[PDB]
Amino acid sequence: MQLSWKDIPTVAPANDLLDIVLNRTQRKTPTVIRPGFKITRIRAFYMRKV
Amino acid sequence: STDSIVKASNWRLVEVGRVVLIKKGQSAGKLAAIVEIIDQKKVLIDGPKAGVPRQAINLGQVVLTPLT
Amino acid sequence: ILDTESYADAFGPKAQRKRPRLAASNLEDLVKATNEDITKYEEKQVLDATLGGNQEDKENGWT
Amino acid sequence: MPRSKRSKLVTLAQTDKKGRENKERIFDEVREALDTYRYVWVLHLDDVRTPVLQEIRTSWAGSKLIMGKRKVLQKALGEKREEEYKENLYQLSKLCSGVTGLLFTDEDVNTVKEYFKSYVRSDYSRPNTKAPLTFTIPEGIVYSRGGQIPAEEDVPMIHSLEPTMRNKFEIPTKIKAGKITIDSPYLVCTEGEKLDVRQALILKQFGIAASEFKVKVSAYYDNDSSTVESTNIN
Amino acid sequence: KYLYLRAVGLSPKKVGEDIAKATKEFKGIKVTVQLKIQNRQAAASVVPSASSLVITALNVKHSGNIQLDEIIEIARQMRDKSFGRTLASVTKEILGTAQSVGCRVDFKNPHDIIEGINAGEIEIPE
Amino acid sequence: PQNDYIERHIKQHGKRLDHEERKRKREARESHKISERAQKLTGWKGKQFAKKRYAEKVSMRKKIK
Amino acid sequence: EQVRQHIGRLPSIDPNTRTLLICGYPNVGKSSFLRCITKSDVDVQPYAFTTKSLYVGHFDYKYLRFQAIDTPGILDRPTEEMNNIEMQSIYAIAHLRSCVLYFMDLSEQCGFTIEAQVKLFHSIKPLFANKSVMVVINKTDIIRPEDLDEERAQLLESVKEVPGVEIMTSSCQLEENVMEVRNKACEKLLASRIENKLK
Amino acid sequence: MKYIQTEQQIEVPEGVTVSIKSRIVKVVGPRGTLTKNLKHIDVTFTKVNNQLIKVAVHNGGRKHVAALRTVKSLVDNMITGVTKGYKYKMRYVYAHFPINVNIVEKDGAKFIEVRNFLGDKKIRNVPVRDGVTIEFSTNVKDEIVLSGNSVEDVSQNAADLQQICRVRNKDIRKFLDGIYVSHKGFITEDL
Amino acid sequence: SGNGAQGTKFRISLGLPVGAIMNCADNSGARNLYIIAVKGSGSRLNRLPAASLGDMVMATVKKGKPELRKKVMPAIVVRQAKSWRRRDGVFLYFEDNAGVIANPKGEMKGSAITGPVGKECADLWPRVASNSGVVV
RNA sequence: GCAGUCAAGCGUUCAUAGCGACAUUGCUUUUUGAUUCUUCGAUGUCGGCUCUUCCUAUCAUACCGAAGCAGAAUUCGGUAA
RNA sequence: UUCAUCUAGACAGCCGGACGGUGGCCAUGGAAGUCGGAAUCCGCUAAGGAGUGUGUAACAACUCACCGGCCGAAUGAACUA
């Protein structure tokens, strides 16, 4: 908006942003696979993490 | 007319001169005077008129009697 | 620029940048520069007004 | 020591604890002064501002005033005859009665006693004493002096002082447009009041130095005459 | 009553054009000055201060090479308002102030004149 | 509101009447709450709490030294 | 983060709407032009910079919306040695199409002799080469132009030499005078805008 | 290590008579009577004197000796409440909407009724605990005084007002409104 | 309810599922509207979002003025062929189901509406009631 | 990740023989949001229709805490399936 | 366990002092120990930083570190299990 700029989102520090995004990955993605799974499932797991 | 009243439990005290009643062991049912206090659980008792040798004994082995 | 003045020196509670580092020589050159900037900006707004009426479609709220 | 204990709060300041050797130094300086100077007065300076003490200490140069722990001074002079330092000196360590200073000097006894009779400077009305006045904080915007210079002559009290005025001083204060303000006049103390801590902290806060200070001097030890004269100028 | 200020080198518009006289004996050296108002008119005065007098013995920086004949002088202007049994003490405050400023006294750093006095190598008229 | 309007508000009206004491009490309780967190935060939050406490203690030590 | 916190607080100055800046020294003692001619809170107590940023207020004149801007203040230094606080005032003057109101305090209170304020005006004259400018002499309820000195009045008549500049008396303690000053400033501003629009 | 015997001393003043049987303490004095049930603490009392009472724990741990000073201080607060009496003064402050705090009998009981808190149409009812007297000072505007023989009741009811007017979903740096304890004291002042 | 809707809306039988062509009642130049979405609809699994009288939809102009087609503008249903209940008990229906082009705040793009407009829609949308020559 | 650094500590007998937490530095596409609008061998067949339940690592809704959180909105976090 | 402090008064509390050159130098709208950059010394001392933090537009005030008064006898720190 052109006359005011109240609406910028909160920009966290670097380590805080690190914690935020990394923990969102560890929470909003599944976190259990086993080495006995098909390598396709292991791959899909880690590609999803990335 | 208006004094403080506090109900004091009159516990027998493990004190030098308290006489105990040995409830088990070779001195069963014999009196013995407490001679010194060793620690919280053990004391040195002596019961010479009843035939108790001077010894260090647990307090769970004897029963405090009202006599001092 | 970060070698000479840092972000902390540029702005903040510990800011040290108190004067503009490229202050103009005098007031009148500042004024004529400002007039040129305003003319350029307003001409830019005019020329971009030739591309839009999609902004006005936002007044009628379709996409 | 077993757990759940108060954590000692330390900070990063420059000055360090003095220790035993500073007391040894005070002890030895008192000893040498006793050997050197003649007259040794014991001065009671229980609550003394340092500029006052430094002016007193510089209103003469050829003498020396020594302070320190009362116990270390009584030790240096000696508790009793069995441990004293000069003949009949223990009658001085029996006369060290608080914040005590030792005034080793060669000035005539008359000069010193008249000076300590006639020296006075104003101080804050320190607590636990009879109040030397009565100031009522006026109603309205409280100013720095609380009315002791007029309102147009004084500046408003800092808004940041209001939490202290309201919590530590118990004065019912408001903030009206950034100015501390009481709706009704508030009296702090009356003449003759045995001051509490908060009364004397309020009086110091407004810079009310209506009271005065002078040195309470008890007996002095005359070195060569080896006796003590119980002067007492309270 | 008295009002003190340092920002020089209550009727504001009048005293400013009256205290210029007392200052500007100092070539733009910042000096504490006082005011002695009687009813509504003030009189200007320059207060003897260590830092301001050290500068006149010479952004900007101070290197000095001041000679010790004047440090004892500057100290001598401040004996009445200092806690010094000797002029050696007061010249030691002045040498401390000079070391704060950044100058050098008799062509070396002002602090060695402290232990110069302490070792007896330097002596002070008294 | 336009320019540092919260300092302006604190200057013109002060803070809440219990702000000093409620803040001081929270600070005093923080020593208890550190222990409570270190003994009750479980799992990943507990692991992070332990690691940040170790880092804060080593930074305090280095500050001292 | 610091920029976002600060930039979200900045006022909402519209360069294009009817604006009028309040230059010079309007904020003296209890009085302030921005607190009196519009609803807005501006700190006042006599030191050189009691506000470090632009403050905006608003009012309505002849059913139109106006904004009034209080500038943090300017010193009479050259441009190569002025700081950001007064670059704010200078940028506000130079950009916003406004009616500049330059205040002087003939009283003692601002901390400036009359000729200092006039020399400052002669310094910031070139910023005015495009706007409409007014001079406002305030605190006349505490000063006497009848006993105003001849050299003082000789400089004050000398500021009217600048084209488009006209002075007024005023006193913030009488609302009628401040409303008069605001009214004529607005009238000049509508005059210029209408001459533009009907062109 | 188990302390053989650790003791604390509860000093009874001249006008107070305390009765302690089976760790139920009754304290009676000029301002009324108080009773507290201490049966959850294994602690032993003793009347050493008409003006002193000894409270003691035999063979106690570090957690058990932590309860002697609590018991002693609780009995001490009883004594001070029954002689000096506790007086909590709360001041309610507001920016735009004036808080209206009245005392109303709802259903045979006594209630502080807070109204118009930040313009709320909700009426906030805080029950008055028994033995707590709610009084409105006239000398100072907008101040409540709570008094009673029990510090526990007075302080709890004061904190109940403090919390019933908690500001929700607003920036409490800007919204200063509420009922705040200003001063905790004694009714007398000075003896 | 929606943006610009006046007050609550009671239940009426849903007539217009997604994918339903409805006439353009106004004079904006569209000849029919194609409902692609319905405002306010709940998320039931296989249930198509359905629209009724007085409901705001999202519609594409499928036939008509080329200045209006290929665009997705909000619309407000003003008629309905599915019989619904009026509380003063009568089940009624119109002969066609139709709507009007509205900006999301409720204003009519057109300057008039032709044919009847249900009172449940005229009442709910003031700009519809203000542009409808025939109500009920 | 590799290669360094520092050193709380460790080894100990020699703290330089060596280990070594935390912290940090170099490498990764051009300092002015332009591009980098940009794709590069899954040897894999699982996936939808209906329908139930569980997990919490919570998206929403409930209640809280911390933020320049004025309001509105938002962000981060807590209890919570 | 090691080290340290302690009737030359220990730990915890109140109470008091917490000074003088001095508002040290530079900076600038202001910057007085406390936005900052470098000095960081002297005096007077029982002790008191060219200042540990809250604070002020700057000051003021409060604070600690440091002494001292009251009290009276043990206490603190780092480590190990």
Q: If DSSP states are collapsed to H, E and C, what string results for chain I?
A: CCCCCCCCCCCCCCCEECCCEEEECECCCEEEEEEEEECCCCCCCCCCCEECCCCEEEEEEEEECCCCCCCEEEEEECCCCCCEEECCCEEECCCCCEEEEECCCCCECCCCEEEEECHHHHHHCHHHHCCEEEEC
- Contact yes or no for F16 and H181 at CB 8 A: no
Chain A hits for G10, Cβ within 8 Å = 4-5
Q: Are chains G and F in touch, 3+ Cβ pairs below 8 Å?
A: yes
The letter for the amino acid at A20 is: I
CB G52 within 8 A of CB G69: no
- Tell me how far apart the alpha carbons of residues G24 and G89 are, in angstroms, rounded to a whole number: 10
Give the DSSP letter string of G125-138: GGGGSSSEEEEEEE
Touching subunits of E (3+ CB pairs, under 8 Å) are D, G
If you search the block for the tokens 């799992």, which residue do you land on? F43
- Tell me how far apart the alpha carbons of residues G117 and G120 are, in angstroms, rounded to a whole number: 5
The residue lying closest to nucleotide K77, measuring its CA against C1', is D8
CB H191 within 8 A of CB F33: no
Residue H169, CB, strand J, below 7 Å: yes
SS3 H100: strand
- Contact yes or no for G108 and E17 at CB 8 A: no
Residue E114, CB, strand K, below 7 Å: yes
Query: What tokens were used for D31?
Result: 């000893």
I71 is a domain residue: yes
The residue lying closest to nucleotide K16, measuring its CA against C1', is D47
Nearest by Cα to D141 from D128, D155, D127: D155
- Contact yes or no for D184 and H139 at CB 8 A: yes
Cα of first residue to Cα of last residue in chain H, in angstroms, is 42
Domain end among H85, H120, H147: H85
- Residues H35 and H80 reside in one and the same domain: yes
Q: How far is H108 from chain D (nearest CA, A)?
A: 35
Chain E hits for D54, Cβ within 8 Å = 83
Residue A18, CB, strand J, below 7 Å: no
Question: Residue E81 carries which DSSP code?
Answer: G
- Residues H23 and H72 reside in one and the same domain: yes
- Residues H93 and H153 reside in one and the same domain: yes
- Tell me how far apart the alpha carbons of residues H115 and D234 are, in angstroms, rounded to a whole number: 62
F interface test, pick of G5, G9, G58, G71 with most F CB neighbours within 10 Å: G9
Q: CA neighbours within 13 Å on the CB side: how many for G97?
A: 14
I7 is a domain residue: no
Q: Show the domain range for H105.
A: 86-191
Touching subunits of D (3+ CB pairs, under 8 Å) are E, F, H
CB G164 within 8 A of CB G56: no
Beta strands in chain H (DSSP E): 3-11, 17-21, 24-29, 32-37, 44-46, 52-60, 86-93, 100-105, 110-115, 124-127, 133-136, 143-148, 178-186
SS3 H183: strand
I5 is a domain residue: no
Query: Which CB contacts under 8 angstroms, 24+ apart, belong to G177-181?
Result: G178/G33, G178/G36, G178/G37, G179/G37, G181/G37, G181/G101, G181/G134, G181/G136
Residue G44, CB, strand K, below 7 Å: no
- Tell me how far apart the alpha carbons of residues H166 and I92 are, in angstroms, rounded to a whole number: 54
I110 is a domain residue: yes
Cα of first residue to Cα of last residue in chain C, in angstroms, is 44
Nucleotide nearest to D102 (CA to C1'): K46
I89 is a domain residue: yes
Provide the chain H residues 168-187 that lie in CB contact (below 8 A) with chain D.
Answer: 182-183
- Tell me how far apart the alpha carbons of residues D81 and D92 are, in angstroms, rounded to a whole number: 11
User: Quick check: bond before H190 cis, omega within 30?
Assistant: yes
Whether residue G70 is annotated as binding a ligand: the answer is yes
Question: Residue H129 carries which DSSP code?
Answer: P
CB I29 within 8 A of CB I64: yes
Polymer length of chain H:
191
SS3 H97: coil
Residue A23, CB, strand J, below 7 Å: yes
Nucleotide nearest to C4 (CA to C1'): J31
Residue E93, CB, strand K, below 7 Å: yes
- Contact yes or no for B4 and H19 at CB 8 A: yes
Report the CATH architecture of B13-68: Roll (2.30)
Q: How far is I31 from chain C (nearest CA, A)?
A: 17
- Residues H93 and H80 reside in one and the same domain: no
Residue E34, CB, strand K, below 7 Å: no
Residue A3, CB, strand J, below 7 Å: no
**CB neighbours of residue E97 within 10 Å:** 21
CB B60 within 8 A of CB B20: no
Sheet-wide strand order for B30-37: B52-58, B42-47, B30-37, B19-22, B62-64
Touching subunits of I (3+ CB pairs, under 8 Å) are C
- Tell me how far apart the alpha carbons of residues E118 and C45 are, in angstroms, rounded to a whole number: 78
- Residues H51 and H119 reside in one and the same domain: no
Q: Show the domain range for I38.
A: 15-136
Question: Residue H149 carries which DSSP code?
Answer: S
- Residues H61 and H42 reside in one and the same domain: yes
- Tell me how far apart the alpha carbons of residues H70 and G89 are, in angstroms, rounded to a whole number: 65
User: Quick check: bond before H189 cis, omega within 30?
Assistant: yes
CB D132 within 8 A of CB D122: no
- Tell me how far apart the alpha carbons of residues H68 and D4 are, in angstroms, rounded to a whole number: 17
The count of structural domains within chain I is 1
Chain E hits for D61, Cβ within 8 Å = 85
CA torsion I118→I123→I125→I126, rounded to 10°? 120
G interface test, pick of E5, E8, E10, E13 with most G CB neighbours within 10 Å: E13
Chain A hits for G12, Cβ within 8 Å = 3-4
The letter for the amino acid at G49 is: F
C38 touches chain G (CB under 8 A): yes
Question: Residue D8 carries which DSSP code?
Answer: P
Which residues, 6+ apart, have CB-to-CB distance to B31 below 8 Å?
B19, B20, B21, B22, B47, B49, B50, B52, B65
- Tell me how far apart the alpha carbons of residues A37 and E42 are, in angstroms, rounded to a whole number: 94
Residue D13, CB, strand K, below 7 Å: yes
Which residues, 6+ apart, have CB-to-CB distance to G76 below 8 Å?
G116, G119, G120, G123
Nearest by Cα to I136 from I68, I64, I66, I86: I86
CATH number for the domain that contains residue H94? 3.90.930.12
Beta bridge partners of B5: H19
- Tell me how far apart the alpha carbons of residues G173 and G181 are, in angstroms, rounded to a whole number: 13
**CB neighbours of residue E43 within 10 Å:** 14
- Contact yes or no for B5 and H22 at CB 8 A: no
Whether residue G52 is annotated as binding a ligand: the answer is no
Beta bridge partners of H133: H147
F5 touches chain G (CB under 8 A): yes
Nearest by Cα to H43 from H14, H5, H81, H13: H5
G55 touches chain F (CB under 8 A): yes
Query: Taking the mean position of all CA atoms in its chain, how far away is CA E51?
Result: 4
- Residues H98 and H188 reside in one and the same domain: yes
Residue A6, CB, strand J, below 7 Å: yes
A41 CA to J27 C1' distance (Å): 33
Query: What tokens were used for I76?
Result: 């407000």
- Residues H128 and H65 reside in one and the same domain: no
The letter for the amino acid at G25 is: Y
- Contact yes or no for F64 and D159 at CB 8 A: no
F interface test, pick of H155, H174, H183 with most F CB neighbours within 10 Å: H174
- Residues H175 and H111 reside in one and the same domain: yes
Query: Taking the mean position of all CA atoms in its chain, how far away is CA H150?
Result: 5
Residue A43, CB, strand J, below 7 Å: yes
- Tell me how far apart the alpha carbons of residues H6 and G184 are, in angstroms, rounded to a whole number: 87
- Tell me how far apart the alpha carbons of residues E119 and D175 are, in angstroms, rounded to a whole number: 61
- Residues H52 and H91 reside in one and the same domain: no
Burial D140-169 (b: 16+ CB within 10 A, else e): bbbbebbbeeeeeebeebebebbbbbbbeb
Domain end among H85, H111, H139: H85
G interface test, pick of A11, A16, A20 with most G CB neighbours within 10 Å: A11
B3 touches chain H (CB under 8 A): yes
Which residues, 6+ apart, have CB-to-CB distance to I13 below 8 Å?
I52, I82, I83, I84, I85
**CB neighbours of residue E94 within 10 Å:** 29
Which residues, 6+ apart, have CB-to-CB distance to G104 below 8 Å?
G24, G25, G114, G117, G118, G135, G136, G137, G138
- Residues H179 and H91 reside in one and the same domain: yes
Chain H hits for D184, Cβ within 8 Å = 139-140
D87 CA to J17 C1' distance (Å): 69
Phi and psi for G33 in degrees, rounded to 5? -65, -35
Beta bridge partners of H105: H110
CB G103 within 8 A of CB G177: no
D50 CA to K48 C1' distance (Å): 10
- Residues H134 and H93 reside in one and the same domain: yes
Touching subunits of C (3+ CB pairs, under 8 Å) are G, I
**Rounded (10°) angle between helices F19-40 and F43-64:** 120
SS3 A42: helix
D203 CA to K39 C1' distance (Å): 40
Q: Nearest by CB to C63, from I72, I105, I109: name it.
A: I72
Beta strands in G2-159 (DSSP E): 19-24, 55-61, 64-70, 99-105, 132-138
- Tell me how far apart the alpha carbons of residues E103 and E64 are, in angstroms, rounded to a whole number: 4
**CB neighbours of residue D95 within 10 Å:** 19
CB H129 within 8 A of CB H156: yes
Whether residue G57 is annotated as binding a ligand: the answer is no
CATH number for the domain that contains residue I30? 2.40.150.20
Residue F29, CB, strand J, below 7 Å: no
Which residues, 6+ apart, have CB-to-CB distance to F59 below 8 Å?
none
